[PDB]
Write an enzyme that holds these catalytic residues in place. Structure first.
Site, PDB file in Angstrom:
ATOM      1  N   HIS A 102       0.782  -1.234   0.040  1.00 39.77           N
ATOM      2  CA  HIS A 102       0.007   0.074  -0.045  1.00 39.77           C
ATOM      3  C   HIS A 102       0.967   1.178  -0.070  1.00 39.77           C
ATOM      4  O   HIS A 102       0.325   2.390  -0.162  1.00 39.77           O
ATOM      5  CB  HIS A 102      -1.154  -0.039   1.058  1.00 39.77           C
ATOM      6  CG  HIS A 102      -2.381   0.748   0.839  1.00 39.77           C
ATOM      7  ND1 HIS A 102      -3.570   0.343   1.517  1.00 39.77           N
ATOM      8  CD2 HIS A 102      -2.770   1.395  -0.238  1.00 39.77           C
ATOM      9  CE1 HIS A 102      -4.407   0.825   1.231  1.00 39.77           C
ATOM     10  NE2 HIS A 102      -4.036   1.686  -0.306  1.00 39.77           N
ATOM     11  N   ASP A 125      -9.836  -0.452   3.780  1.00 38.74           N
ATOM     12  CA  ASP A 125      -8.813  -1.217   4.532  1.00 38.74           C
ATOM     13  C   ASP A 125      -9.249  -1.423   5.921  1.00 38.74           C
ATOM     14  O   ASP A 125      -9.993  -0.933   6.459  1.00 38.74           O
ATOM     15  CB  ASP A 125      -7.725   0.149   4.645  1.00 38.74           C
ATOM     16  CG  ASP A 125      -6.229  -0.812   4.643  1.00 38.74           C
ATOM     17  OD1 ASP A 125      -6.087  -1.573   5.384  1.00 38.74           O
ATOM     18  OD2 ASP A 125      -5.120  -0.163   4.021  1.00 38.74           O
ATOM     19  N   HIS A 127      -6.748  -1.218   8.088  1.00 45.32           N
ATOM     20  CA  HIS A 127      -5.745  -0.338   8.543  1.00 45.32           C
ATOM     21  C   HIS A 127      -5.912   0.964   8.048  1.00 45.32           C
ATOM     22  O   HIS A 127      -6.667   1.233   7.051  1.00 45.32           O
ATOM     23  CB  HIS A 127      -4.318  -0.777   8.146  1.00 45.32           C
ATOM     24  CG  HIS A 127      -4.035  -2.206   8.529  1.00 45.32           C
ATOM     25  ND1 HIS A 127      -4.511  -3.102   7.383  1.00 45.32           N
ATOM     26  CD2 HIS A 127      -3.660  -3.063   9.577  1.00 45.32           C
ATOM     27  CE1 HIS A 127      -4.110  -4.519   8.038  1.00 45.32           C
ATOM     28  NE2 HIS A 127      -3.566  -4.429   9.119  1.00 45.32           N
ATOM     29  N   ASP A 129      -3.602   3.349   7.912  1.00 44.67           N
ATOM     30  CA  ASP A 129      -2.228   3.551   7.075  1.00 44.67           C
ATOM     31  C   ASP A 129      -1.881   5.014   7.146  1.00 44.67           C
ATOM     32  O   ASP A 129      -1.486   5.844   6.095  1.00 44.67           O
ATOM     33  CB  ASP A 129      -2.358   3.196   5.457  1.00 44.67           C
ATOM     34  CG  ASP A 129      -2.250   1.728   5.234  1.00 44.67           C
ATOM     35  OD1 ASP A 129      -2.269   1.002   6.543  1.00 44.67           O
ATOM     36  OD2 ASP A 129      -2.888   1.255   4.328  1.00 44.67           O
ATOM     37  N   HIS A 142       4.284   1.073   4.404  1.00 41.98           N
ATOM     38  CA  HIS A 142       2.936   0.782   3.964  1.00 41.98           C
ATOM     39  C   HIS A 142       1.849   1.021   4.837  1.00 41.98           C
ATOM     40  O   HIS A 142       0.613   1.262   4.350  1.00 41.98           O
ATOM     41  CB  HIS A 142       2.685  -0.668   3.562  1.00 41.98           C
ATOM     42  CG  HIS A 142       2.685  -1.732   4.527  1.00 41.98           C
ATOM     43  ND1 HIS A 142       2.158  -2.796   4.334  1.00 41.98           N
ATOM     44  CD2 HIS A 142       3.149  -1.647   6.015  1.00 41.98           C
ATOM     45  CE1 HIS A 142       2.262  -3.600   5.509  1.00 41.98           C
ATOM     46  NE2 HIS A 142       2.907  -3.047   6.396  1.00 41.98           N
ATOM     47  N   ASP A 231      -7.168  -1.842  -0.402  1.00 40.21           N
ATOM     48  CA  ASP A 231      -6.338  -2.941   0.249  1.00 40.21           C
ATOM     49  C   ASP A 231      -7.230  -4.182   0.429  1.00 40.21           C
ATOM     50  O   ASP A 231      -8.208  -4.308   0.944  1.00 40.21           O
ATOM     51  CB  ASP A 231      -5.924  -2.296   1.500  1.00 40.21           C
ATOM     52  CG  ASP A 231      -4.575  -3.187   2.140  1.00 40.21           C
ATOM     53  OD1 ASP A 231      -4.589  -4.473   1.875  1.00 40.21           O
ATOM     54  OD2 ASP A 231      -3.914  -2.582   2.808  1.00 40.21           O
ATOM     55  N   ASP A 233      -6.679  -6.780   2.035  1.00 40.51           N
ATOM     56  CA  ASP A 233      -6.675  -7.249   3.396  1.00 40.51           C
ATOM     57  C   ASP A 233      -7.860  -6.813   4.177  1.00 40.51           C
ATOM     58  O   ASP A 233      -8.112  -6.720   5.479  1.00 40.51           O
ATOM     59  CB  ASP A 233      -5.446  -6.978   4.079  1.00 40.51           C
ATOM     60  CG  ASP A 233      -5.087  -5.471   4.575  1.00 40.51           C
ATOM     61  OD1 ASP A 233      -4.109  -5.498   4.983  1.00 40.51           O
ATOM     62  OD2 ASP A 233      -6.150  -4.781   4.789  1.00 40.51           O
ATOM     63  N   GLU A 276      -1.879  -5.060  -1.813  1.00 45.05           N
ATOM     64  CA  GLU A 276      -1.581  -6.309  -0.806  1.00 45.05           C
ATOM     65  C   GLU A 276      -1.490  -7.444  -1.066  1.00 45.05           C
ATOM     66  O   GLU A 276      -1.730  -8.342  -0.451  1.00 45.05           O
ATOM     67  CB  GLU A 276      -2.174  -5.643   0.439  1.00 45.05           C
ATOM     68  CG  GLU A 276      -1.869  -4.381   1.185  1.00 45.05           C
ATOM     69  CD  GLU A 276      -0.135  -4.346   1.437  1.00 45.05           C
ATOM     70  OE1 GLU A 276       0.428  -5.550   1.606  1.00 45.05           O
ATOM     71  OE2 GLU A 276       0.264  -3.310   1.703  1.00 45.05           O
TER      72      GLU A 276
HETATM   73  N1  LIG Z   1      -0.750  -3.554   5.694  1.00 45.02           N
HETATM   74  C1  LIG Z   1      -1.069  -2.751   6.692  1.00 45.02           C
HETATM   75  N2  LIG Z   1      -1.891  -1.760   6.238  1.00 45.02           N
HETATM   76  O1  LIG Z   1      -2.240  -1.488   5.058  1.00 45.02           O
HETATM   77  N3  LIG Z   1      -0.580  -2.397   7.660  1.00 45.02           N
HETATM   78  C2  LIG Z   1      -0.274  -1.548   8.750  1.00 45.02           C
HETATM   79  C3  LIG Z   1       0.305  -2.052  10.050  1.00 45.02           C
HETATM   80  C4  LIG Z   1       0.413  -0.835  11.134  1.00 45.02           C
HETATM   81  N4  LIG Z   1      -0.654   0.012  11.479  1.00 45.02           N
HETATM   82  C5  LIG Z   1       1.833  -0.104  10.730  1.00 45.02           C
HETATM   83  O2  LIG Z   1       2.022   0.989  11.068  1.00 45.02           O
HETATM   84  O3  LIG Z   1       2.869  -0.581  10.043  1.00 45.02           O
HETATM   85 MN   LIG Z   2      -3.284  -0.496   3.639  1.00 47.44          MN
HETATM   86 MN   LIG Z   3      -4.578  -3.180   5.297  1.00 50.46          MN
END
Ligand SMILES: N=C(NO)NCC[C@H](N)C(=O)O
Ligand SMILES: [Mn+2]
Ligand SMILES: [Mn+2]
Ligand SMILES: N=C(NO)NCC[C@H](N)C(=O)O
Ligand SMILES: N=C(NO)NCC[C@H](N)C(=O)O
Ligand SMILES: [Mn+2]
Ligand SMILES: [Mn+2]
Ligand SMILES: [Mn+2]
Ligand SMILES: [Mn+2]
Lengths: 310, 310, 310
Positions: A102, A125, A127, A129, A142, A231, A233, A276
């Site tokens: 990402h 997502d 997350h 991010d 990412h 994303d 995931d 992802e």
């Molecule tokens: N794959 C993702 N996001 O898309 N993970 C982020 C995980 C975590 N929040 C970080 O700062 O790394």
């Molecule tokens: Mn992401």
């Molecule tokens: Mn994610």
């Protein structure tokens, strides 16, 4: 009806290698044929050699700036993506970017907002991010793209990222499917009042309402262009197993796709990132197939594919 | 903000052994640390030696009163739980009980209604656990607690249960997630007009509405304290495999947890039981981990844990 | 309250063999006992020897009329089913047909509409089964029944099907759970304005609304008899694995059954087909058991079985 399928096989924004294989896998699944079948005049756009970059990432463990891992490498590549996507839009073509982790969205969103500065952004997502360079605990870039696009923690951001144009405001980004937000990110989203719809809203209102709300939040005049960075995931791992950071309690396969149709149905999508997908992160051939075909499915659905007559 | 985590490793209310391991497993999963992290000043409360009771259950097959299996043993232990929970509440602390089969709730509910006699009770379960001593076909006491609390079939109830105080009325108990009700129980619930929301209502109205309805049914003045006895087997076995009596068509992992947040969001929860976790009833390490971590998840969510800023 | 359980072990409407074993498997799962338990005075009705027909299908690869495979054989058997179902209804008994691939519904629907010409038809399926003899790409007749009942492509339909009475109009058929419709079928459904609810509507409005809409679409006066032809492959394969043509993104086990209760609750069901169960198309004993028990579950639920007091 012209489309450029931007290939972005990058994996420097995170630990696991294999996610740079996404572009190839998707394409062999018939992604381009699918876009053609949907009536899209398509042409591929390669930004850089996937294996060459893997070599530079595998070796150079000295590329860091605090906890942040591989900032130079990520900056170099995301800049090439930015430039690429920018041209693709200037040419009046729809850019569909396939990752790759990402962190590529730093190039994509930057590229799209360069031609459509009023474009809203839907971040599908699990997350947020949005971690800052200083705040990122993991250091995996990412999970930091949005902070950079938003110009947060401007002071602690390095030189290799000065190329990033400041064109994204907090009121033009809306999350969907959130369920793995870091404490740092929870505060930020709250401080900036970012419209974020966690799995809680999906369970509470159902995917339809959420999508509606998500689209309204970034589209005031009801005419704004819309971009979606998807994303995979976000979807429950029992559907998308081959991904770097899976979290239980995700969107169902049906929701994952319904969400796309609602968007397509919106008629204002100007760009899409599908990220992802890490084939090497599976256990069987169905793990990978299910994951990659899901990627292609989001693409067809976003691009107009319906279950009934159209 | 004081909490007492009552450990109740009992398994006499049913056939399979292993469910008494719940307390330990949960605790090693970091349950207490989690409650601390949520800001809860916690302290454990042990009621009896788990292995000592297993010995008395494994041997004494002569402890019966009709089809009812192990009534004396169940009465002795549930009484100790009652007393324990009663004190914990008199001390003004929130009692979170970890089982152990569901027959422990005879002690828990009895204990809570002793300090908060106007407390409503939400029974999250796939089963109604309201079979009478005379009516129980299986004889497994974990499916009879509510009948005893309600004082039903008073005549055929034994001496070893005289300690059970009569403080629970039919209009203060509400079920959620029912789908495996016995004919005897169907009649009873109907005769007593007990508010029961089966999977049918969840499918019909969605979990949100149900939760709302469930909370209203036991909370007339809208001020009443609320208690939730949470049987993990309410959740579809594809999420909670390690449980004694699983039934297909259960709540999804998302619903299981969303339900908790709605309750927490209610701001009136006074107690919580998390039961039926049987680690030894799995096939893999993920079967147990998924089950136990789900148990801890219900705890965090009930106790305030949210996906976004709080 | 009389019922005739019509056994239709046919597999000529499609490639895979084994689906003719449905009737036997269901029956051994206790289907008839279940209908009895529901208070249904039941009696079985055998139309033809399942193994004898398999022999004629396995050999005679010369039975074709274009791409259409085994038209004569399908016509002969579906005619016997038509006649059978017709008598069963003339006798004032409820006909519950167990297949067998979906081509049997040519006999069932034809039989039911012969006694209840104003009956609406709810087609619970992932497929529209409306391909014409000329349009069918696969040539598997189980995907062509509706076109024949509707009298479409009258010109290219053969002699062996002249026995098919024309009694079904487009405004009396409503689909539910569609997600694998052929281009040819998409046009047809659109041309004829057939009420079809794809998975998109389920995701959008939830199963309840859809069922309501589905029932209204075929029931103008609100008094019409209702018939449901239930293809088990409508349910997501992760629930119904043993089926000939599975498609991801199907109804959940809960929706599959809730749908039945809503119908039963309608009080106007006059017939029911439960098709596409192919035991030999599994990987384990649970694959088959889960599939077959799901078949029996649809039967109990359709026939009145509820989770609570009734
Ligand atoms: N794959 C993702 N996001 O898309 N993970 C982020 C995980 C975590 N929040 C970080 O700062 O790394
Ligand atoms: Mn992401
Ligand atoms: Mn994610
Ligand atoms: N595990 C439970 N309930 O929680 N099962 C109860 C089963 C059955 N109703 C009985 O009376 O034994
Ligand atoms: N099993 C079914 N339908 O019930 N499949 C139909 C597949 C395809 N539409 C055809 O014409 O053969
Ligand atoms: Mn229980
Ligand atoms: Mn239970
Ligand atoms: Mn069918
Ligand atoms: Mn089908």
């Amino acid at each position: 009806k012209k489309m450029s399928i931007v290939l972005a096989p990058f994996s420097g924004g995170q630990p696991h290698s294999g996610v740079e294989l996404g572009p190839d896998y998707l394409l062999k699944q018939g992604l381009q044929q699918d876009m053609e079948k949907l009536g899209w005049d398509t042409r591929l756009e390669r930004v850089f050699d996937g294996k060459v970059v893997e070599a530079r990432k595998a070796s150079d463990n000295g590329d860091r700036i605090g906890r942040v891992k591989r900032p130079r490498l990520t900056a170099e590549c995301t800049e090439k993506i930015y430039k690429c996507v920018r041209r693709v839009a200037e040419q009046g073509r729809f850019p569909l970017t396939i990752g790759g982790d990402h962190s590529i969205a730093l190039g994509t969103v930057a590229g799209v907002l360069s031609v459509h500065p009023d474009a809203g952004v839907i971040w599908v997502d699990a997350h947020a991010d949005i971690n800052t360079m200083s705040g990122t605990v993991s250091g995996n870039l990412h999970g930091c793209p949005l902070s950079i696009l938003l110009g947060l923690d401007r002071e602690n951001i390095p030189e290799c990222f000065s190329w990033v144009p400041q064109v994204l405001k907090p009121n033009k980004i809306a999350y969907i499917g959130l369920r793995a937000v870091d404490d740092e990110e929870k505060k930020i989203l709250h401080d900036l009042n970012i419209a974020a719809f966690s799995m809680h809203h999906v369970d509470r209102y159902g995917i339809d309402k959420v999508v509606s709300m998500a689209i309204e939040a970034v589209s005031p005049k009801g005419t704004e262009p819309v971009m979606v960075s998807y994303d995979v995931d976000t979807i429950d791992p029992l559907y998308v197993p081959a991904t770097g950071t899976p979290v239980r309690g995700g969107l169902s396969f049906r929701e994952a796709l319904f969400l796309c149709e609602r968007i397509a149905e919106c008629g204002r999508l100007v760009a899409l990132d599908v990220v992802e997908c890490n084939p090497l992160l599976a256990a069987t051939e169905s793990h990978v197939n299910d994951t990659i075909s899901v990627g292609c499915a989001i693409a067809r659905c976003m691009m107009g594919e319906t279950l009934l007559y159209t």
